[PDB]
Design a protein around this ligand. Structure first.
Ligand code: NA
Ligand code: NA
Ligand code: NA
Ligand code: NA
Ligand code: NA
Ligand code: NA
Length: 302
């Protein structure tokens, strides 16, 4: 645990949190990881336990051991939770992707959303209701949901989520929304404007922010562009930067800081060895679970 908490410093500027991720393994693999989470971060997103493959492996049969653990740890330690994720083309069981009848898929979708959200009703700050539903060009991804139900799946997902847990902020999350003017950014904005105008309850836009070295400075403009979609809020949801340079990390932190709609940042992992992109050493803590230069840079920029 770093003596200075970047989450505490971020909150002092009016932000909701500066968080990270976890699940049973990383929370128990050693003593430093959970200690770092409790001391320096104020929010948690389950890395995998809440995804469709892990929660409803078979039709109508749910498995909540792993998600229960993450939620219970977060709640027992004063950490906000971002549920992740409800509807996604990846990490989706074959029983779902093989469905071809529209009403059947809708029933399945609603039951999945309802069962998962009901179990953690009132304990979730925000839910990534929809994940990665856009092609790079801004058009809608031809996932099973889009192919079988059509664009109406967006309304169905959000309305169902809103009804099940009105306390949670409902988000649409995506990657490559990293610079103003990018086709995917433009598509996100135009679709969300349309959906909101149609009465669909979308509270926020989540920008994954999985970056390469030197890409941090473009984030400020991206958030500004995303702000025009008209949602109540936005958030950097899965932050990691190849090389973890101080300039890049400070640039991203400042991007959120200077944008009213950005409620917080979630770094996708604590220490490099546990990163899904470990070969790029993209996190704030090293192989010894010690704070890297970027962590201190962030602490001193706040
Ligand atoms: Na998850
Ligand atoms: Na689970
Ligand atoms: Na989809
Ligand atoms: Na809601
Ligand atoms: Na917005
Ligand atoms: Na976040």
């Amino acid at each position: 645990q770093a003596s200075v908490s970047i989450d505490a410093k971020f909150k002092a500027h009016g932000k909701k949190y500066l968080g990270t991720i976890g699940d049973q393994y990383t929370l128990t693999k050693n003593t430093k990881n959970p200690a770092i989470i409790k001391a320096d971060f104020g929010q948690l997103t389950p890395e995998n336990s809440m995804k469709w493959d892990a929660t409803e492996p078979n039709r109508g049969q749910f498995t909540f051991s792993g998600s229960d653990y993450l939620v219970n740890f977060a709640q027992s330690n004063g950490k906000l939770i971002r549920g992740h994720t409800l509807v996604w083309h990846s990490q989706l069981p074959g029983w779902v992707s093989s469905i071809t009848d529209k009403n059947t898929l809708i029933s399945v979708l609603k039951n999945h959303i309802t069962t998962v959200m009901t179990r953690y009703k009132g304990k979730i700050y925000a839910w990534d209701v929809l994940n990665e539903i856009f092609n790079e060009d801004g058009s809608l991804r031809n996932s099973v949901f889009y192919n079988v139900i059509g664009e109406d799946y967006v309304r169905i997902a959000f309305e169902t989520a809103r009804s099940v847990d009105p306390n949670a902020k409902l988000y649409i999350n995506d990657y490559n929304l990293d610079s103003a003017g990018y086709s995917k950014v433009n598509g996100m904005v135009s679709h969300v404007k349309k959906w909101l105008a149609a009465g669909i309850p979308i509270d926020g836009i989540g920008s994954q922010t999985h970056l390469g070295a030197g890409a941090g400075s473009a984030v400020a403009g991206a958030l500004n562009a995303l702000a025009s979609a008209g949602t109540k809020e936005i958030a950097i949801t899965e932050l990691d930067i190849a090389g973890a340079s101080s300039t890049d990390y400070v640039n991203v932190v400042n991007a959120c800081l200077n944008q009213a709609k950005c409620v917080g940042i979630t770094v996708w992992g604590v220490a490099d060895p546990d990163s899904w992109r470990s070969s790029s050493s993209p996190l704030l803590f090293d192989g010894n679970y010690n704070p890297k230069a970027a962590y201190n840079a962030i602490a001193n920029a706040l």
